[PDB]
Amino acid sequence: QYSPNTQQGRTSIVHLFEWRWVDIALECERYLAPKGFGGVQVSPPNENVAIYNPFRPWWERYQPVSYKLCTRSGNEDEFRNMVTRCNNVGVRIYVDAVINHMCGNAVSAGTSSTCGSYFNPGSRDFPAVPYSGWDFNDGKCKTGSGDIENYNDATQVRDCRLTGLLDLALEKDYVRSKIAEYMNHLIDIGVAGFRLDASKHMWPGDIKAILDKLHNLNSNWFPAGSKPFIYQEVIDLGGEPIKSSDYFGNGRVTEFKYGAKLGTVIRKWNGEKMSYLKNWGEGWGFVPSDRALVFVDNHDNQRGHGAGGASILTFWDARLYKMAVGFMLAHPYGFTRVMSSYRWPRQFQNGNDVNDWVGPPNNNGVIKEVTINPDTTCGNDWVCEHRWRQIRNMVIFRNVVDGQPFTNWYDNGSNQVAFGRGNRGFIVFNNDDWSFSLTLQTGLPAGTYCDVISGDKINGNCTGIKIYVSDDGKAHFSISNSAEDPFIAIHAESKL
Ligand SMILES: *[C@@H]1O[C@H](CO)[C@@H](O)[C@H](O)[C@H]1NC(C)=O
Ligand SMILES: [Ca+2]
Ligand SMILES: [Cl-]
């Protein structure tokens, strides 16, 4: 459960948030494979409630109606087509599995679902699965409202409704089997793993009973005995009775303290500085590296819908965001996930973005195709952060330095720091309000190296900054606090 099952030498996955299957298939072939991305986290592929008020919000996909592979992203054939084409090019697919609940208890019965399946939340009837009143935790929850009212009670956090979402009785073998049937269908199609949505709201033991029913990965693409990669979404900042460590026996866990603290450090909130990142990782009270799935922002908290709240860096904060993602991709801790978003009309009223529910670019509800501009950026309001040179090049940087120790750390006691990864890579950052000009020990072999943040090594030459490393591994770096990207990264393969 702990290994991503990526191809040897590919170290990151991208969340192509709300993308259609056909666009992901194309992207696997035209960009992800050539650029060395290990895999893709896709949005929930099962049928969900179609919510028209507000108009098709992104969160309607977290309210299941059935396990039919029928959504705004595409149908079952298109889903299969995408998994096959991506796998055939070495890029894995990870499914967002929404298995803790069905839709809101207050949603109207009818056939307002993405595949036209009938459902009746009021009577707990989801015939397309099928599920009935017996498969929900209505009689097990002990709160007066039936919803989760207090997180200091670990029992109600698991048995009651997360803001009204009907809660599946996961201790029942029937329910566990319906979920396993769904996941095995996906494993046999070829997916490499799952993000278990809302894991904090499920008992570690019920999750394990479900995982025990899962198949090994498809032997047509994976070695025999391969187990699906499992990463559980557990928001564990401090102070709650539920700890992410309680889920280690099941697979990896999302480490939300990662992006939260990186954001405050990079924003320099409340006295924090980059020099403090010297012992970043377990030293900061994070989970062990081999159990961590890290990221700067995720689909929830990039729109204020989650852990970290205000300090979270997102594409809207482009200059600082690139620096944070760069630090994440160069640091040895955890398995990294890169975010890929869409633009929405933020609209802050009293500090709250009243448009945080806006769904993906669409024409009358039909999600728009990702179009590629001549300069490789995307059109139709897809931000495509994974295509930004500074990010794409750092994805490759991680691949190149995979396995190398963290060494040659330097910091000016403020916000100018640098470190290397063995003798395969080196990165320098200037987040101070003055310039950086110093000769540092890089641990790299003598030569001329292309800085992959400002440019690329394109046919024997660098299109941006060049660094010259002398025989003793020393090199001079100059970064003014006015640079569009206040950081420089060089590695074995950008060497001229
Ligand atoms: C690097 O570019 C310069 C021209 O701008 C040229 O003199 C040189 O041939 C180039 N090297 C290669 C390998 O293309
Ligand atoms: Ca639950
Ligand atoms: Cl997540």
Q: Specify whether 307 is located in the same domain as 384.
A: yes
3-state secondary structure of 302: helix
Q: Is 387 annotated as a binding residue?
A: no
**Residues contacting residue 426 through CB under 8 Å, at least 6 positions apart:** 408, 418, 419, 420, 440, 442, 443, 444, 475, 489, 490, 491
CATH code for the domain in which residue 224 is found:
3.20.20.80
Q: Specify whether 412 is located in the same domain as 381.
A: no
Q: Which residue has the tokens 């943040």?
A: 453
CA gap 211, 206 in Å, rounded: 9
- CA-nearest residue for atom 3, ligand 1, is 461
Q: Specify whether 357 is located in the same domain as 435.
A: no
CATH code for the domain in which residue 440 is found:
2.60.40.1180
Task: Examine the fold and report which residue of 380, 403, 426 is the final residue of a domain before the chain moves on.
Answer: 403
3-state secondary structure of 58: helix
Where would I find the H helices in 141-249?
Answer: 154-159, 173-189, 204-211
Q: Specify whether 217 is located in the same domain as 236.
A: yes
Q: Specify whether 153 is located in the same domain as 218.
A: yes
The count of residues in the chain is 496
Q: Is 451 annotated as a binding residue?
A: no
147-to-64, 83, 101, 164 alpha-carbon distances in Å: 18, 37, 12, 6
Answer yes or no: are the C-beta atoms of 5 and 193 closer than 8 Å.
yes
Extract the tokens encoding 138: 């209505």
CA gap 200, 300 in Å, rounded: 15
- Nearest ligand to the C-alpha atom of residue 460: 1
- CA-nearest residue for atom 11, ligand 1, is 460
Bond into 228 cis (ω within 30) = no
Q: Specify whether 366 is located in the same domain as 445.
A: no
Q: Is 173 annotated as a binding residue?
A: no
- Counting atoms of ligand 1 from 1, which one is nearest the CA of 460? 13
CA 446 to chain centre: 37
Extract the tokens encoding 234: 């557990």
Q: Specify whether 434 is located in the same domain as 399.
A: no
Distance, CA 110 to ligand 3 centroid (Å)?
A: 31
Distance, CA 255 to ligand 3 centroid (Å)?
A: 9
For residue 54, what are the domain limits?
Answer: 2-403
Entry resolution in angstroms? 2.0
Task: Examine the fold and report which residue of 363, 386, 403 is the final residue of a domain before the chain moves on.
Answer: 403
Distance, CA 17 to ligand 3 centroid (Å)?
A: 11
- Nearest ligand to the C-alpha atom of residue 101: 2
Phi, psi at residue 86, to the nearest 5°? -70, -45
Of 197, 297, 432, 451, the active-site residue reads: 197
Of 233, 297, 300, 356, the active-site residue reads: 233
CA gap 52, 282 in Å, rounded: 44
267-to-256, 276, 302 alpha-carbon distances in Å: 17, 13, 15
Answer yes or no: are the C-beta atoms of 201 and 100 closer than 8 Å.
yes
Q: Specify whether 52 is located in the same domain as 161.
A: yes
Q: Specify whether 148 is located in the same domain as 288.
A: yes
Extract the tokens encoding 279: 């012992």
Q: Which residue has the tokens 């760069």?
A: 326
Rg value, the chain, Cα = 23
- Counting atoms of ligand 1 from 1, which one is nearest the CA of 461? 1
CA 68 to chain centre: 24
Task: Examine the fold and report which residue of 388, 403, 418 is the final residue of a domain before the chain moves on.
Answer: 403
386-to-31, 296, 340, 341, 470 alpha-carbon distances in Å: 10, 13, 6, 9, 33
Bond into 34 cis (ω within 30) = no
Q: Helices 173-189 and 204-211, interaxial angle, to 10°?
A: 50
**Residues contacting residue 306 through CB under 8 Å, at least 6 positions apart:** 235, 256, 298, 300, 312
- CA-nearest residue for atom 2, ligand 1, is 461
User: ∠ CA(335), CA(276), CA(256), 5° rounding?
Assistant: 35
Q: Specify whether 366 is located in the same domain as 440.
A: no
CB-facing half-sphere around the CA of 185: CA atoms within 13 A: 15
Q: Specify whether 272 is located in the same domain as 410.
A: no
**Residues contacting residue 58 through CB under 8 Å, at least 6 positions apart:** 17, 18, 299, 357, 358, 359, 360
Residues with CB under 6 A from ligand 1: 459-461
**Residues contacting residue 169 through CB under 8 Å, at least 6 positions apart:** 134, 135, 136, 137, 140, 175
Distance, CA 416 to ligand 3 centroid (Å)?
A: 30
Q: Is 100 annotated as a binding residue?
A: yes
Is 233 noted as a catalytic residue in this protein? yes
Q: Say which experimental method was used.
A: X-ray
Helix (H) or strand (E) holding 400: helix 389-401
Q: How many domains does the chain have?
A: 2
Select from 456, 461, 463, 496 the residue to mutate for testing ligand 1; criterion: most ligand atoms less than 8 Å from CB: 461
Q: What is 355-386 written as a DSSP string?
A: TTT--SSEETTEEPPP-B-TTS-B-TTB--GG
CA gap 212, 227 in Å, rounded: 10
- CA-nearest residue for atom 6, ligand 1, is 461
CA gap 29, 281 in Å, rounded: 34
Extract the tokens encoding 443: 């641990």
Extract the tokens encoding 148: 């989760």
Q: Specify whether 220 is located in the same domain as 92.
A: yes
Extract the tokens encoding 200: 């904090």
- CA-nearest residue for atom 7, ligand 1, is 461
Distance, CA 86 to ligand 3 centroid (Å)?
A: 22
Is 282 noted as a catalytic residue in this protein? no
